[PDB]
Design a protein around this ligand. Structure first.
Ligand SMILES: [Zn+2]
Ligand SMILES: [Zn+2]
Ligand SMILES: [Zn+2]
Ligand SMILES: [Zn+2]
Ligand SMILES: [Zn+2]
Length: 138
DNA sequence: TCGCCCTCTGCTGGTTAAAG
DNA sequence: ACTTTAACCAGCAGAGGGCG
């Protein structure tokens, strides 16, 4: 148990605590030699270098499209070649979304606070949430 | 042990097609 | 028959954990 003093992270390996702390300090030791990207750990630099090398190690076994990362391919297979996958229902409206991160986009765009407000395009009423604005305009 | 490799996670911007 | 818009999607970068 090697505990971070700054959060609840803990590990059974000293080296993992050292890596974790760079998330607080922002130290990025592993620099790309071709662009400005730099990583906190060795793996994400190698994964990034695949984009310079053109290395695409992953191939969809159904349609043979090729991918640079494994999770990209997995998501492609889930969304394009799989039926009856559970969908994301927004709690604040009736929209249904296929991907969790797209639900995130929707929450931030439609249900977040707009400090400077937005006026209806047909009337002088002002709203501070896009969903309420669009509902009013209708 | 720790470099290596896996996985789960999550934002961005181009495309597309639907609504009004 | 045109704009506006937001989900769909590939792409890329975030982290935590097992093990030879
Ligand atoms: Zn911490
Ligand atoms: Zn680079
Ligand atoms: Zn495929
Ligand atoms: Zn919603
Ligand atoms: Zn109005």
């Amino acid at each position: 148990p090697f505990k971070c003093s700054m959060c609840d992270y803990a590990s059974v390996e000293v080296s993992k605590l050292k890596r974790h702390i760079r998330s607080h300090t922002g130290e990025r030791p592993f620099q790309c030699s071709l662009c400005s990207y730099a990583s906190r750990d060795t793996y994400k630099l190698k994964r990034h270098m695949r984009t310079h090398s053109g290395e695409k190690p992953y191939e969809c076994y159904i349609c043979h499209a090729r991918f640079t990362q494994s999770g990209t391919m997995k998501m492609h297979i889930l969304q394009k070649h799989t039926e009856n996958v559970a969908k994301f229902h927004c709690p604040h409206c009736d929209t249904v979304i296929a991907r969790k991160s797209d639900l995130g986009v929707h929450l931030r765009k439609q249900h977040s606070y707009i400090e400077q407000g937005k006026k209806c395009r047909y009337c002088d009423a002002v709203f501070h949430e896009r969903y309420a604005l669009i509902q009013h305009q209708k």
